[PDB]
Amino acid sequence: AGADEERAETARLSSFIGAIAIGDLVKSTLGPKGMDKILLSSGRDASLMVTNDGATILKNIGVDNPAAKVLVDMSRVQDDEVGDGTTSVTVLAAELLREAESLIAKKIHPQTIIAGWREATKAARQALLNSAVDHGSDEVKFRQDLMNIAGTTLSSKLLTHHKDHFTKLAVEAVLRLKGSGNLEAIHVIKKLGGSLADSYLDEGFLLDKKIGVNQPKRIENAKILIANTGMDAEKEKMKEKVERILKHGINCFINRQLIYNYPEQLFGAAGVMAIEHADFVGVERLALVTGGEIASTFDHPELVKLGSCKLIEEVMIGEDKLIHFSGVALGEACTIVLRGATQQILDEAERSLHDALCVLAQTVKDSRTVYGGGCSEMLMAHAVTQLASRTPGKEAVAMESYAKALRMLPTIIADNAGYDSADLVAQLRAAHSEGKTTAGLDMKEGTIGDMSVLGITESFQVKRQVLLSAAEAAEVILRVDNIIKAAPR
């Protein structure tokens, strides 16, 4: 008959239900002992996908009408900002909705209560001044570079047997990236072949193509040629390419498409390595790296093109054949390569590096971090309980509810571990209350322990953005009472 209409308490309920459904699935995926989840869907799915990253799975699908997709969409902007470690920001937003049950008892104006969000700003910043944070990584740093936050991101993920080693590698990659440049030229790829190292580092850019079985194994003081057009009377074509080639000393040719067979015989004898159907996206990054070139007709060699002469070679990774470009003069652009166990757990690493590279970039800019494993959450909770009573009252109603929202974070960490959640809460509050910031939830123990020995740390950046953002994501939904007058029909 018309538009979707909900009034008073019913409008509140739709938002309320969406938050509870998401929280139970996400809880098992938090901190150093999370659970892998496999998802099955019909049509245009073709099977099951398993994601250990909460943000990636929510973005992909809009299962039903109940509002949550827009809230979910927001987490990605956060991902660019800092994004991860462990997924948990979504869970905290969900918790605040449980409170609205006691609100009906309040019975007057729900938006006056919204002052809690005003309060949230005051409560949020008490964690952004208080704690113990850390002494931030000064720059490059020999051993404080990793085996810390990256490991924690990994710990919720099972592959952390071989994988924690990979995580250690990521900081080295960020160090070259470090300073004023921001994020550019990082694409990193993985393979179906297993090796103990499970990762190779490249000075320049990494591809995955071979000229053919024949051709010189290694090229040095290399000249690089990039052609927009394909190589696809015939002898005349052959000759133009060879005469221009020999004078230059051309060491490598890269073409973004199919390549005609005659050129291939020529390149092998000359001592020149060529690449068939190189993807266009890889090529654009390479141009910035080598100083660039103008890609025209076979006239394209000589001065219309600029070449970087350090080291280009093709080596066998272990199973799959790849080609290594390195020693770029520009230095601005670099490439990371990962190896793995070989199943799906490995593809997880594909998921992990994208998340890991950006967080580290923020780590150098922030120069501040906080203890992980929920150590940060309990300390703040002790401080916030005191605050509600102290404020006059309108302020107090609002302030106290926010404070108890912090409490199940310890619970969520412990619950996914496989230990009794209430028991965990009892011991945890006492250690934080005493004054030890290092102490936190230890999932491996089943109780609590020293977070620092683990080396688990969370970026200072994740805590400031979540606190301000959580209030805003929750506030929009709660602030508006009754939604009516819309449907197209």
Place this chain on the structure above:
Amino acid sequence: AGADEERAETARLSSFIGAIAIGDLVKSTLGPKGMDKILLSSGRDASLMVTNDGATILKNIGVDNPAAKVLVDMSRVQDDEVGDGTTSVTVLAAELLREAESLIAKKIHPQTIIAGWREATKAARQALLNSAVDHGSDEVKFRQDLMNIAGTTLSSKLLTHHKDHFTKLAVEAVLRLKGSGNLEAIHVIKKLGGSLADSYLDEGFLLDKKIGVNQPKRIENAKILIANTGMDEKVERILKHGINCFINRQLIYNYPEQLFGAAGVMAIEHADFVGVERLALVTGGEIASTFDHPELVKLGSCKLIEEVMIGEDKLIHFSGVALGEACTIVLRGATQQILDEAERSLHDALCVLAQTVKDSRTVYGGGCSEMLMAHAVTQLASRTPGKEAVAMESYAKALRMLPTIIADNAGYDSADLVAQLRAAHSEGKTTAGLDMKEGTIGDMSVLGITESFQVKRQVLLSAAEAAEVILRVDNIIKAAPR
């Protein structure tokens, strides 16, 4: 039929439903501007009954199968010990059940949570000590004797125009009681007569019975005779003793009646047993059996027994008891719905402040006690280990509703009230509380409203044990209306 057994959610549900149904009706009653309700029942009641006092209506009727009657039955023992004034204890027990729906999320063991009840006992003792109570009320006292708690008990009642004066009088009655002997021998009745005072204080015991048309009008240096067995030998035993009055708890045979008139002895036909039992303690007692009962077996006090006119109608008074352990109270009323209410109020008044001289401790009224207690209970949950804390912290916000109910009956918006209330209590001023006449927060002490320390200690334990018996135990349930 017969016995029943209960399953997971349904068992909890039966207890859960009982608490919510009773909370709403009792809710209007609390506070100075509470309102009366009238109930009619299924053929054993005879008519419409209106009771301002929450406890009286619940005791009289066992409406349905759900566990509530045993919870309800307990409130009267509380009344005996102290719990009266305004009904609040039942309300307090009832919202603890709401927390249980939240508790389903708490997937572990509900009984573990139960450990919270003596944690709560710690909370009761945490509450007691941590809250400035009072330092006044030395004994008898010129002005702190009342114009305090009785007035608040009365405040929830409309009568408080002429009636607040009556409440002040109640303390004089306790003043004569203080000493060694306990709380006993208090009886109150009302009469048809208009007066601004609306009461008189009487020294002796009030009774209203007469032997017959003939007999001496007044007896002097009276001896009292009590017989367990009915009249349905007497002169010979009587003359030697010098008996002046005979009291029998039952029907009296006609033949002896002629004898008593000529002798000059006043007898009482069908005297009620409750007055008689008290009397035995009063007169030194007697051994009540068959007609052998006279002389030494019985002891009789002997000041004066006479029939006196009390303003209007004629009444008989027993006074001048040698023992000194028992007394009686008589009230005269203008007549209205609220005067026999004094029956309700005096019974309650006696327990509230007799207790007050014994305690030497009281707390500020008008909800001053509840917000302060709420302020310090929140810290305590955090102070205690965390799973203990989860149960303890839920208890702490429970106290929040009392401030809201006090204000709500006043006529002022509840949201604003909660807000202004907490800031004054948090600051450290115990005297400050909810001033309903203001609609805001004010000085409770100026009002003169104070609560007996026992009402607060006793309510806490009574609520804890009563709440504990629910969540714990199965065997009940509810079905359909009327």
Place this chain on the structure above:
Amino acid sequence: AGADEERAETARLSSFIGAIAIGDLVKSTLGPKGMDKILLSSGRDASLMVTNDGATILKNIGVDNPAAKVLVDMSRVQDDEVGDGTTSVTVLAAELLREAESLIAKKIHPQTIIAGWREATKAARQALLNSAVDHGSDEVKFRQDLMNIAGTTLSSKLLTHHKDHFTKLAVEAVLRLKGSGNLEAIHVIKKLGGSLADSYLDEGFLLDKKIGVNQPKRIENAKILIANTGMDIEHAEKEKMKEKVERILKHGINCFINRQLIYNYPEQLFGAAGVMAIEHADFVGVERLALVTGGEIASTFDHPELVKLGSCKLIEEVMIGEDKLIHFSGVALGEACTIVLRGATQQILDEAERSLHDALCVLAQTVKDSRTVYGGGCSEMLMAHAVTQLASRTPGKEAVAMESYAKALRMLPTIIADNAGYDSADLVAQLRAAHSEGKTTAGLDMKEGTIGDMSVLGITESFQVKRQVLLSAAEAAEVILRVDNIIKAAPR
């Protein structure tokens, strides 16, 4: 949004039902006494098919909605390593699910229980150390080459009267193949027409194709040509003809094998030359054969002489009781050989195809491992006695999960006895007393109805079959229970 969302208990139920549904049909299959079972379906299913192999029927059809096909698919990779014996891996994986009902009562994180599988690895390798393991195959081996495990694999099979004889033959085949990296070029099929042997051994590799009715009847010291590209105005055609004849002649070419369609013109040429060619030869046959011959490089018609490697002994078309088949033989390599099965002509004949897969993998393993364990469930009861101690030994959560895994082993003795035709209850306790005492040889005797000496029977299971099954069962069960979501992901 056709996504399937499963909730805690419901999530177990889909999988729980899938495990129970498959368990009953597979159960009758195990032991010396088994049930044949045939299935009929509408739409591109002309007639009933009989499966004495739990694995074969499960792979062919994905009958219902509930997840189990991937679990089912996995059993075949097992088949490559060891496979057969009797179908027990699926049964054991399913039995673990039934005590999960007990787990709801426990009412804690289900994943905590998962520690039992790690516990299972301990149990899995104690299937080792609890065996004195035969002592010495001695490679090749005179008398105990077979009349052992193959017989057990076939004991459940209906054909055990005549067929136990062909099972015996299978080990001779493995002996030829020694250099025990299981199988290269081992291809055997069932053939029509009866014989007492019900099987024949060919020194070479079989096939089922002919060039044409005309051509020389047979070839000697034959050279083999294999072409990737097909043989597929007249004067232009003749040149194509000439290239093929001019260089074919120098070699002395006796046989040509091409995988795909063959052009008609060369066919006349081959007959006069004295060369036998094969039209549309199957690719799978061709490279295994190539391993046998010495591996050629297949290019364009330049392919003759050296770029082709031809082994020469005897290539001929030989009448085999029935039809008439093409046989390649006398391979120099010796590494790869072919066994040809024959039968009366029974659906049960199709049994041999199953049996073959079963025969090849276990025997190859038996020679490399030089270790094996007693069959008939001897291994299973002994392991069960040890695991009971483990449950009591470990505190709290670990004992509950370890204990449940331990009782799972108890059911296998019951299934072994149940298919026998004897009372299962009596069998279980008598069995436990002999294993507890310390006799590894003692085990379930299905014909006996009671417990007996397994070694006399000759039934033994490869050391690999026991270590891998136990690890595999754990992983198969873990993929479901371990993960509590199963929802969303795919734009639409």
